[PDB]
Design a protein around this ligand. Structure first.
Ligand SMILES: CCCCCCCCCCCCCCCCCC(=O)OC[C@H](COP(=O)([O-])OCC(O)COP(=O)([O-])OC[C@@H](COC(=O)CCCCCCCCCCCCCCCCC)OC(=O)CCCCCCCCCCCCCCCCC)OC(=O)CCCCCCCCCCCCCCCCC
Ligand SMILES: CCCCCCCCCCCCCCCCCC(=O)OC[C@H](COP(=O)([O-])OCC(O)COP(=O)([O-])OC[C@@H](COC(=O)CCCCCCCCCCCCCCCCC)OC(=O)CCCCCCCCCCCCCCCCC)OC(=O)CCCCCCCCCCCCCCCCC
Ligand SMILES: CCCCCCCCCCCCCCCCCC(=O)OC[C@H](COP(=O)([O-])OCC(O)COP(=O)([O-])OC[C@@H](COC(=O)CCCCCCCCCCCCCCCCC)OC(=O)CCCCCCCCCCCCCCCCC)OC(=O)CCCCCCCCCCCCCCCCC
Ligand SMILES: CCCCCCCCCCCCCCCCCC(=O)OC[C@H](COP(=O)([O-])OCC(O)COP(=O)([O-])OC[C@@H](COC(=O)CCCCCCCCCCCCCCCCC)OC(=O)CCCCCCCCCCCCCCCCC)OC(=O)CCCCCCCCCCCCCCCCC
Ligand code: HAS
Ligand SMILES: CCCCCCCCCCCCCCCC(=O)O[C@H](COC(=O)CCCCCCC[C@@H](C)CCCCCCCCC)COP(=O)(O)O[C@H]1[C@H](O)[C@H](O)[C@@H](O)[C@@H](O)[C@@H]1O
Ligand SMILES: CCCCCCCCCCCCCC(=O)O[C@H](COC(=O)CCCCCCCCCCC)COP(=O)(O)O
Ligand SMILES: CCCCCCCCCCCCCC(=O)O[C@H](COC(=O)CCCCCCCCCCC)COP(=O)(O)O
Ligand SMILES: CCCCCCCCCCCCCC(=O)O[C@H](COC(=O)CCCCCCCCCCC)COP(=O)(O)O
Ligand SMILES: [Ca+2]
Ligand SMILES: [Cu+2]
Lengths: 54, 54, 143, 189, 63, 573, 126
């Protein structure tokens, strides 16, 4: 997200997104992006463990 | 030439697979339709790996 | 599928009759609420709409000739008649999800009209389709 | 006996090929509507002077030849001949890959002397119909290559035979569509 | 029957409040808010009626 | 004959799998990514459909709030226009069509006695493509310009490179195309399981009405979705490149209109026949009577298969480009099979024993609604009447009695009906009745008077109107009752969430009592392969004869009107 | 029997014995509340617009709602009702298909008429 925000002006134009919206996505996404990533990854790890036991 | 894995069938009043008919209701097994499962754990050649941590 | 191959003749002949009525009625009738002349969308796509039903009907008809009396097609069949193997069903696979993701990438490629994105999406789709088919074929890992 | 019964994969593929035919119903509809009002003002005649009819016949026979070789390949799969299937599928790939190059070359030689998408209604209608067919042919060739590399790893049971038979179905459909599309474009005008 | 009549009266008073509230706020943004008020009122009334019409012909018994 | 097996000593029972309340961490996360089970797929296929329902219905409230009073209070022309475009699209292609295949994926293999679907990895692809298409289509709202704003019909030349520029219009096209691949990917294997994978003794005419409806829909969806893909890719070819196919100077407007409506009405009937089937499942079970005129229903459904193809330009009477007599008459015919299968429902309920559980309540609240919807359908089918009513607000009321009729009342009926089968738990009856009454009053209120306004001169896609028109009180009433309709989902969501993990446990393989379909001969939920044992199928109701043997002679002796004299006939060899 | 390793049961996380498993519930809330602080602190920039603040408050509300139902851990109970022709907990389901195949139990007592209606003559059973 930091890397994308670092080139968010080339993202904004080429993908037709508001540059202000991109800044806010970066700001908010740094809090809720990591949280969702943790949740999904944890559940998927346990899922892979379960399939391994079956 | 006939493939070794081709099911041993009489080439008289019987065909295993044609354009439109077959012997099963569904997809033919990719591990031989004439293969009897399950088999003994020895034939699989799976070696259960004893591991100890620390 | 003894009766399945037969019931398609219904829609086939119906649509074939409507398509010929349509062409002749549209090119020779002046209503005043429209103009005169054959319509080239309701004609081609209704002639060829009957084509689909005819194709499927004929294929199933040829197929059903050279099939024996199956227990599912037999009126008084015991449950123990089909006792055997119902062939091979895939238990699980990750590739459907991947190839949906691949078509999504190509989709956005076409939306934004980015050549690199279209090219990558096209070859990202070939790869996933290939892996779907070669799923149960991947050889035992040779050292 | 073993109580023979319909090939599930073959019936699945035939039901898929039926829908692919209605995909070209749209394209044919677009072509015929544009043809109808192109003849009205006597503009259609001028546009169809860009067609190389003799050249479009050579590629037609190439595609028909590919079909026949494809069928030969499938005749070899019923009997479990791995090598019969392998040989004829390669020749079909070669034959079908020169159609695409041939078709592609026609495009390059057609845009050189006036006919493009953004030049006339005829140009747009010619390229929509012939373009999508070319995409389908490419997809068919890739299907052949994946079947070739599928029977390189698996043990060639009736499962691989079925995969080959259905890919042949797809190829036959593609070439039949071409036959119907060549008559429409190059003969009926 | 107990819950019902209470829900009907509460819904009725809320709906009346909403109907009255629409008349002041002419064609402003607050007309939408008043619409939400009457919708909530009507919702509560129908909820009361539904619970009334369930204890009349019940399909589930308390164990 | 019957070949009674010897009584084996020791046979106790199957495993009787556990309900859905007790799930451990990781038990579902990676399973859903790679699943090829039609049961779990169907569950997630329905859930996703309802999510899109809630999302797409929120747009209807924003539209409906703006129309409360004259003047633009919070919403603009541009935002209003792209708000009914995306509302009519998400509800028809992201909720409507998927919810059709959800009830198809789950119960069709379970109704014919199949272990699985024919192509397990293909319907797993059909789920993932539809969701991707949905997400792609809605990405339009994340652009500064907005989503597509032309309606859900994308008329030409309003929808070309010149008019309506912006990436939202491409996203709409591409998303529609993708969601249309999921429909054909699902129709392939809903048609080949019926042919190939069927239980011993289940002839084609032993299959329930539901499976017959999905059979007809499958063959009907194969010839309409490709056509839409072709038409939409023709428009994309026109927009992205410089194609001239859709220029007004060579058809273009009419070309697209024909091409679109040719699949416009077949997709409409892909949303009606399965839900007619769902209702045709619920009525006989709660009436303790068989499905009146079973073969009659078969013929009716088959008629609508073929007739629906010849009626497409009744959507364009006011164009002045179509043959009015041809499409006017053809449309009048397609009401006749519907009338037949509609009399069959009454016949099924006729002198029956009706118990009023939630499914039966929903099903009866369906017929009363769809009836009026269809009644004002034959109005529009006559060009002398459709001249005033076309592209107007009476039309809006018409296809909300038929869409909100079939895809909402019958869908919810199906959810209440099959919930014990899908989950092993039962939904709260009181909350179900509350939900029904809310969604019923709140719907009729918001859509009845909609007829009256459309006749007096309000056209459909209007962001604003003047106070000097008389369309103020009517809009106000509609908005009030619409906000009420929006609240009805609260009991539904609470019921589904609570009852999924806390609902009463189902301890019998047929909770509704008199189920007569092969799904009611298995545990709730079924054990991963649909069947721990298979009964003898001798009629269209194998589960009924399985549960009630003492009346097998009664249901054959008095099934016909009379002159039934085969019970006293000599035996065959 | 399931084993607990570091407060994490092998029943819930199979390979509890192999790696770092389970964050203490108090650390999941510290992160949550710190995040809420940051999200509330975003409202103190120079931005003149109010669209972004609507999103900030909505997301903060969703975070707060989540962090409360994670804290108090709301639970419910089994409904414990009876619906039409549904049996209470502790009912044993007869194998209907087994009873149908061999004339036992549910299909244990049919009238001779009822035998012939299902195509089997009573002389074949003793
Ligand atoms: C919605 C969209 C869903 C997409 C998500 C699904 C993609 C899954 C990736 C496949 C890799 C995982 C795998 O092999 O199985 C799991 C595998 C466990 O199973 P396994 O027992 O090992 O058996 C699997 C085989 O080993 C595996 O078989 P193998 O041994 O034959 O394969 C080895 C290797 C093949 O060998 C290679 O190295 C291939 C090299 C790549 C060639 C590329 C050609 C071009 O596999 C790959 O690396 C294939 C990956 C290609 C996937 C491409 C499709 C991605 C979609 C594109 C979207 C792009 C979005 C852009 C982002 C935009 C941001 C704004 O490991 C994992 O669990 C990894 C988990 C990956 C995450 C999946 C969960 C996604 C949740 C996301 C939330 C949404
Ligand atoms: C006429 C034009 C149409 C061509 C007809 C194509 C028919 C091919 C059917 C035969 C086939 O697929 O063989 C099975 C064969 C099975 O290989 P495998 O035994 O599983 O090898 C993997 C083992 O792990 C390790 O086994 P390995 O070490 O023995 O692998 C040998 C390795 C030799 O190593 C390499 O060549 C790796 C370098 C990749 C080439 C990069 C080129 C850049 C310079 O070959 C490859 O990895 C395939 C690369 C072939 C170049 C294709 C471009 O499939 C392939 O690997 C070839 C894929 C065919 C794709 C066709 C693309 C060419 C078409 C247009 C020209
Ligand atoms: C008729 C219904 C109509 C009314 C619907 C609205 C009312 C809501 C009630 C929903 C309900 O019945 O319970 C949900 C029900 C909970 O069942 P459960 O047996 O209690 O499983 C939870 C246990 O903790 C066992 O699950 P777990 O905790 O071990 O696994 C974790 C999982 C648990 O959550 C889920 O399975 C759903 C997450 C998907 C939605 C969030 C998007 C994530 C991306 O969440 C994930 O890790 C998601 C990552 C994998 C998918 C990534 C794609 O979840 C489902 O059945 C999944 C359906 C969701 C639709 C598929 C969405 C595909 C993603 C597209 C992107
Ligand atoms: C527009 C596109 C419309 C897409 C509509 C959805 C596709 C429906 C496929 C129907 C096939 C039915 C079937 O048997 O399923 C097998 C199988 C399902 O797996 P399964 O159910 O677990 O196994 C089936 C049996 O149990 C076991 O059977 P098996 O494993 O032995 O199967 C043998 C397999 C062996 O065949 C192959 O290995 C061929 C692999 C495909 C070649 C790659 C094409 C790219 O044969 C087939 O795949 C069946 C027909 C063979 C020819 C189909 C060629 C389709 C080409 C794509 C259509 C035209 C694209 C033009 C548009 C250009 C833009 C991209 O389906 C596939 O392998 C997928 C292949 C087709 C994917 C096309 C998706 C393209 C989407 C483009 C969006 C833009
Ligand atoms: C089955 C298909 C359909 C359903 C259901 C449907 C529901 C409604 N409709 Fe509609 N509709 C209209 C009014 C309503 C109202 C009041 C409802 C009601 O059923 C409302 C349902 C509302 C809900 C069900 C909302 C519940 C959600 C709540 C209370 C909060 C959700 C919260 C969150 C956080 C969201 C969850 C998010 C997640 C990601 C999980 C109006 C006029 O007010 C127009 C014409 C606009 C114009 O002027 O032309 C219209 C237009 C259409 C069109 C034509 C589109 C076009 O002209 O381009 C179609 C095809 C259609 C179908 C359907 N429609 N409708
Ligand atoms: C790999 C998966 C990745 C998926 C990520 C997808 C999530 C992206 C959401 C994007 C939402 C964008 C909505 C646009 C909103 C917008 O444009 O507003 C702007 C301000 O943006 C905002 O605050 C919105 C930021 C908040 C978004 C939060 C994003 C967090 C994400 C990461 C987490 C949620 C999704 C998780 C999905 C992951 C899947 C696993 C579950 C300010 O407007 P402005 O540029 O000033 O222009 C106007 C003048 O022109 C005009 O005069 C007017 O008068 C002015 O008022 C002004 O509006
Ligand atoms: C890992 C993090 C990377 C950090 C990137 C930060 C995010 C901003 C990305 C901006 C993307 C801009 C895209 C764009 O404008 O497209 C184009 C500009 O940039 C590019 O060409 C992207 C090239 C990227 C590599 C793709 C190579 C494909 C060949 C594959 C062979 C193996 C414009 O479209 P066009 O080139 O005309 O087709
Ligand atoms: C949008 C999908 C429609 C696909 C139709 C296929 C059309 C084939 C194009 C043949 C070239 C015609 C000659 C010509 O005028 O060339 C050029 C114009 O056409 C093109 O650039 C070709 C576009 C490439 C097609 C993109 C493939 C889409 C991928 C499919 C993924 C869904 C001449 O350019 P010019 O006028 O001289 O500047
Ligand atoms: C290439 C990447 C590889 C490196 C991975 C990075 C890992 C380093 C991070 C170490 C994390 C320690 C986790 C841990 O031990 O958990 C806990 C540490 O305490 C915390 O949770 C810290 C709370 C801080 C929250 C920060 C909020 C962010 C706000 C957004 C700012 C904009 C302890 O775990 P335990 O008590 O055992 O459950
Ligand atoms: Ca207003
Ligand atoms: Cu219509």
């Amino acid at each position: 997200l930091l890397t994308v925000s670092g080139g968010n002006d080339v993202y904004a134009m080429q993908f037709h997104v508001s540059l202000n919206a991109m800044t806010w996505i970066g700001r908010i996404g740094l809090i809720v992006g990591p949280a969702i990533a943790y949740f999904i990854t944890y559940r998927l790890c346990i899922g892979l463990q379960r399939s391994d036991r079956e | 030439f006939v493939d070794p894995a081709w099911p041993e069938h009489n080439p008289a009043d019987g065909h295993v697979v044609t354009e439109l008919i077959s012997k099963v209701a569904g997809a033919s097994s990719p591990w031989g339709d004439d293969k009897e499962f399950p088999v003994s754990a020895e034939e699989t050649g799976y070696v259960h790996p004893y591991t100890r941590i620390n | 599928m003894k009766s399945s191959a037969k019931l398609m003749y219904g829609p086939t002949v119906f649509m074939a009759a409507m398509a010929v009525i349509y062409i002749f009625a549209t090119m020779h009738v002046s209503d005043g609420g429209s103009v005169k002349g054959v319509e080239w969308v309701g004609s081609v796509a209704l002639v060829l709409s009957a084509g689909l039903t005819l194709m499927l009907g004929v294929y199933l008809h040829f197929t059903e000739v050279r099939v024996d009396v199956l227990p599912e097609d037999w009126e008084e069949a015991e449950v123990a008649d089909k006792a055997g193997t119902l062939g091979f069903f895939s238990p699980s696979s990750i590739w459907p999800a991947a190839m949906s993701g691949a078509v999504g990438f190509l989709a956005f490629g076409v939306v934004y009209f980015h050549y690199w994105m279209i090219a990558v999406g096209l070859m990202l789709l070939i790869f996933t389709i290939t892996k779907l088919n070669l799923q149960y074929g991947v050889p035992k890992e040779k050292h | 006996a073993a109580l023979n019964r319909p090939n599930m994969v073959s019936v699945g593929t035939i039901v898929f090929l039926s829908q692919e035919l209605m995909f070209f119903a749209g394209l044919f509809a677009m072509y015929f509507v544009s043809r109808a009002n192109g003849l009205a003002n006597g503009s259609w005649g001028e546009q169809t002077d860009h067609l190389n009819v003799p050249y479009a016949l050579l590629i037609t026979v190439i595609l028909v030849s590919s079909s026949v070789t494809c069928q030969f390949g499938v005749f070899a799969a019923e009997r479990g001949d791995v090598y019969g299937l392998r040989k004829w599928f390669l020749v079909t790939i070669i034959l079908g890959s020169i159609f695409v190059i041939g078709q592609g070359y026609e495009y390059i030689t057609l845009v050189g002397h006036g006919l493009t998408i953004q030049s006339s209604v005829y140009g747009s209608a010619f390229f929509i119909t012939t373009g999508f067919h070319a995409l389908h042919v490419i997809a068919g060739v890739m299907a052949f290559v994946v079947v070739l590399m599928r029977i390189h790893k698996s043990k060639f049971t009736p499962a691989q035979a079925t995969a080959a038979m259905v890919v042949s179905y797809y190829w036959h459909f593609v070439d039949v569509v071409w036959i119907g599309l060549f008559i429409t474009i190059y003969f009926i005008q | 029957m107990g819950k019902s009549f209470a829900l009907l009266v509460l819904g009725a008073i809320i709906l009346a409040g909403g109907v009255w509230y629409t008349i002041e706020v002419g064609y402003s943004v607050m007309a939408i808010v008043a619409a939400l008020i009457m919708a909530a009122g009507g919702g509560i009334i129908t909820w009361g009626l539904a619970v009334a019409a369930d204890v009349n012909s019940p399909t589930s018994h308390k164990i | 004959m019957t070949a009674v097996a010897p009584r084996v000593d020791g046979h106790v029972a199957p495993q009787r799998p556990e309900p859905t309340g007790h799930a451990r961490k990781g038990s579902k996360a990676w399973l859903m990514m790679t699943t090829t089970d039609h049961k779990q797929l169907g569950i997630m296929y329905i859930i996703m459909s309802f999510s899109f329902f809630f999302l797409g219905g929120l747009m209807a409230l924003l539209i409906r709030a703006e129309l409360f009073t004259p003047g633009l209070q919070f919403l603009s022309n541009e935002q209003f226009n792209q708000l009914f475009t995306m509302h009519g699209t998400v509800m028809l292609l992201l909720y409507g069509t998927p919810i059709v295949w959800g009830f198809a994926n789950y119960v069709l293999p379970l109704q014919i006695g199949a272990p699985d679907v024919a192509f397990p990895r293909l319907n797993a692809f059909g789920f993932w493509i539809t969701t991707v298409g949905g997400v792609a289509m809605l990405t339009g709202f994340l652009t500064p310009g907005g989503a597509a704003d032309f309606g859900w019909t994308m008329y030409s030349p309003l929808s070309d490179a010149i008019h309506s520029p912006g990436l939202g219009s491409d996203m709409w096209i591409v998303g529609v195309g993708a969601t249309g691949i999921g429909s054909v990917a699902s129709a392939i294997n809903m048609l080949t399981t019926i042919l190939c994978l069927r239980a011993p003794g289940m002839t084609m005419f032993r299959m329930p009405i539901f499976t017959w409806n999905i059979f007809v829909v499958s063959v009907l969806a194969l010839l309409i979705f490709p056509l839409l893909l072709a038409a939409a890719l023709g428009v994309l070819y026109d927009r992205k490149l410089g194609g001239h196919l859709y220029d007004p100077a060579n058809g273009g407007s009419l070309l697209w209109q024909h091409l679109f409506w040719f699949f416009g009405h077949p997709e409409v009937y892909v949303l009606a026949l399965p839900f007619f089937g769902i209702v045709s499942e619920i009525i006989p079970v709660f009436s303790r009577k068989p499905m009146f005129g079973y073969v009659g229903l078969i013929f009716a459904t088959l008629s609508i298969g073929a007739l629906s193809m010849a009626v497409w330009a009744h959507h364009m009477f006011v164009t002045g480009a179509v043959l009015l007599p041809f499409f006017s008459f053809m449309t009048f015919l397609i009401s006749v099979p519907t009338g037949v299968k509609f009399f069959n429902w009454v016949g099924t309920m006729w002198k029956g024993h009706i118990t009023w559980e939630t499914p039966m309540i929903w099903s009866v609240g369906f017929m009363a609604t769809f009836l009026f919807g269809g009644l004002t359908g034959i109005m529009l089918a006559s060009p002398p009447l459709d001249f005033h009513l076309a592209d107007s607000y009476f039309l809006i009321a018409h296809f909300h009695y038929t869409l909100f009729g079939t895809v909402v009342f019958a869908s919810c009926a199906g959810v209440y009906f099959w919930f014990p089968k899908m989950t092993g738990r039962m939904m709260d009856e009181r909350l179900g009745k509350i939900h029904f009454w809310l969604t019923f009053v709140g719907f009729h209120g918001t859509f009845l008077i909609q007829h009256w306004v459309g006749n007096m001169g309000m056209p459909r896609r209007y962001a604003d109107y003047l106070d000097s028109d008389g369309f103020t009180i009517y809009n106000q009433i509609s908005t009030v009752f619409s906000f009420l309709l929006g609240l009805s989902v609260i009991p539904f969501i609470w019921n589904v969430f609570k009852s999924w993990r806390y609902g009463e446990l189902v301890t019998v393989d047929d909770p509704w009592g008199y189920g007569n379909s092969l799904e009611w001969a298995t545990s709730c939920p079924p054990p991963r392969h649909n069947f721990a044992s298979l009964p003898r199928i001798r009629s269209e109701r194998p589960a009924f004869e399985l549960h009630y043997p003492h009346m097998i002679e009664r249901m054959r002796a008095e099934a016909h009107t009379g002159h039934h004299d085969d019970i006293n006939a000599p035996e065959l060899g | 029997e399931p084993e607990i390793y570091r407060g994490v049961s092998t029943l819930d996380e199979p390979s509890a014995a192999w790696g770092w498993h389970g964050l203490k519930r108090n650390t999941i809330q510290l992160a949550g509340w710190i995040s809420v602080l940051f999200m509330l602190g975003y409202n103190f920039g120079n931005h003149k617009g109010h669209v972004e603040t609507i999103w900030l408050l909505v997301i903060t509300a969703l975070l707060v709602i989540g962090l409360l139902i994670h804290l108090f851990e709301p639970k419910l109970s089994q409904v414990r009702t009876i619906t039409s022709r549904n049996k209470p907990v502790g009912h044993v389901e007869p194998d209907w298909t087994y009873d149908q195949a061999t004339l036992t139990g549910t299909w244990g007592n049919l009238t001779d008429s009822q035998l012939r209606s299902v195509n089997i003559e009573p002389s074949r059973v003793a």
